[PDB]
Write a protein that binds this ligand. Structure first.
Ligand SMILES: Nc1ncnc2c1ncn2[C@@H]1O[C@H](COP(=O)(O)OP(=O)(O)O)[C@@H](O)[C@H]1O
Ligand SMILES: Nc1ncnc2c1ncn2[C@@H]1O[C@H](COP(=O)(O)OP(=O)(O)O)[C@@H](O)[C@H]1O
Ligand SMILES: O=C(O)[C@H](Cl)Cc1ccccc1
Ligand SMILES: O=C(O)[C@H](Cl)Cc1ccccc1
Ligand SMILES: [K+]
Ligand SMILES: [K+]
Ligand SMILES: [Mg+2]
Ligand SMILES: [Mg+2]
Lengths: 303, 303
């Protein structure tokens, strides 16, 4: 449904076609988000933070539609400025929704409703930001990238990037962090879009590390490694993240995938990651060994 | 629904109550199996091997109902002889059903039907044999057993028993076998009924070993270990069997749980194991890392 244009061209004609495609596509997608807010239960839609986000989307739609049809490179250039502005203006939207919904959702009893709204809203948003960021990136001169598409992504490398990140957060909080071993198809390289991994990987790694530290309070200086296995085949990329952090309790298991649920970010890591994975044609599955640890399986389809 | 009597008594009164319970229970359960055969699609029910099994059940029902009410230890003793006879007469039933159904099932188009019949038939049969074997075992003087209930089963020990068994089959066929490492709650001991593990474990181990050998045809002398993790908590026992045997292909994944499906026993290992696990209140789940290996998770509820 959403096209990431991979074409390049000397005169910069492909930038024009891309820009014109965005211009047709973005207002429509934003209008769908606005309809989602309009259909929220009244009591939730009246929450001042939800109203703020609703108004941001209306404002986005207005600016996008106010922008004249792109006729030349000069126009396309100014359109990119608008798109950059909107991307920035909306950067905290996930956090505002989480906040606005936290209490308000407790009112209504159809708890399916908020899950559906958040799944639909956050995944459409991911898709919108991918499209827009892709267009902007077409102007960049990065080797191994066409827009936001890496032509030879290494799962091992991007995993290591987020491992370093998560380990530093963990070390800050607990004074130590599990080491991470990576095995399986460590030398794999293939065309792939980093952005979803950039959201999902740190969420899963933070979870695994927290769980490991909290279950080893007596030996923070000596905790079990987290073990990550990469499997690359013609159909999908599988990343298994296995910890010895004690598992997800039976009493918690049916709730960990709910937005807002946490035993402690703000309980969004798992449901958001799963929503993103499925949006892109993959999945996120959990296997809990209560008393031992948890295996988390991220699957993403190849391009 | 099915009670395994754990009571013991000096005068041998508990043997009488147990026997009388069997006498009430067995004919009813067998009649249900007979109704299952009666409702099989005509073309399948007419298969001579299916008819043979159908007739065995009728004959079982006749003998059980022909047996007079148990009034004393002398009677109970003779009833045990009948039960032993029937257990033996029916020992090859799974194999006969597999054979009788193999071709005949291809006729009818509702493929849900055979799955349902086999799930229902095989699990009811497991339950019946557990009840009967339990009663017979009440006469035995084994330490750590009440009937077929082990009062302090070690998952590690019973796993090692079947590991040795599977490794010998594997070595016979391929000239070598993966080593198996066991980790997690290796010292766990708890009350538990071995019989279902005795069916399931060798099936899962044979699968893992076959997969490992067939994916390492160039280095049969040096193959990846199978790794088994035990997790014991207050709710269930989890046994994870992880291999590096290349995984279950995407094109096969939705078929491996079908009776008769095999890429090579006779394609019964997985569906039978899952049926047994669920019958007992647990589950059997597969995680395939195509190109790398497979994790199989057996969960069984504590007693
Ligand atoms: N690897 C894991 N081991 C144990 N528990 C986990 C793991 N991953 C997630 N959880 C549980 O799931 C809950 C929800 O996780 P998440 O949605 O990422 O939100 P948060 O981390 O903000 O609590 C966590 O609070 C934790 O209880
Ligand atoms: N651990 C495993 N690794 C790879 N493939 C497996 C594994 N376990 C089962 N399979 C696949 O599932 C199929 C069905 O298995 P099963 O029901 O046990 O029957 P059988 O072993 O008789 O073929 C196997 O033929 C094999 O292709
Ligand atoms: O992040 C958001 O919530 C929106 Cl989709 C940002 C946006 C980007 C491009 C055009 C319009 C809105
Ligand atoms: O294995 C079988 O198919 C039956 Cl349940 C054997 C049996 C055992 C006890 C009483 C009747 C039948
Ligand atoms: K959550
Ligand atoms: K099968
Ligand atoms: Mg989290
Ligand atoms: Mg098998």
């Amino acid at each position: 449904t959403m096209m990431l244009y991979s074409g390049r061209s000397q005169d910069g004609s492909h930038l024009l076609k891309s820009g014109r495609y965005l211009q047709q596509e973005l207002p429509v997608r934003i209008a769908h988000r606005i309809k989602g807010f309009r259909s929220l239960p009244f009591i939730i839609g009246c929450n001042p933070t939800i109203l703020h986000v609703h108004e941001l989307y209306i404002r986005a739609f207005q600016k996008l539609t106010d922008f004249p049809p792109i006729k030349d490179q000069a126009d396309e250039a100014q359109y990119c400025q608008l798109v950059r502005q909107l991307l920035d203006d909306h950067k905290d939207v996930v956090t505002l929704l989480a906040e606005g919904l936290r209490e308000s959702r407790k009112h209504i009893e159809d708890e399916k409703l908020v899950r559906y709204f958040l799944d639909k809203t956050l995944t459409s948003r991911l898709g919108i930001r991918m499209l827009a960021t892709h267009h902007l990136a077409l102007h960049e001169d990065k080797p191994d990238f066409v827009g936001i598409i890496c032509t030879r992504l290494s799962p091992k490398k991007i995993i290591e990037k987020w491992v370093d990140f998560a380990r530093r957060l963990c070390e800050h909080k607990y004074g130590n962090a599990p080491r991470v071993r990576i095995n399986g198809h460590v030398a794999a390289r293939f065309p792939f879009i980093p952005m979803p991994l950039d959201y999902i990987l740190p969420e899963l790694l933070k979870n695994a590390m927290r769980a490991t530290m909290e279950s080893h309070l007596d030996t923070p200086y000596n905790v079990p490694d987290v073990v990550i296995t990469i499997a690359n085949n013609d159909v999908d990329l599988i990343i298994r993240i296995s910890d010895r952090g004690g598992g997800i309790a039976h009493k918690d298991l049916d709730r960990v995938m709910d937005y807002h649920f946490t035993t402690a970010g703000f309980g969004f890591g798992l449901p958001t990651s799963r929503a993103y994975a499925e949006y892109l044609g993959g999945s996120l599955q959990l296997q809990s060994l209560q008393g031992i640890g948890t295996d988390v399986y991220l699957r993403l389809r190849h391009i």
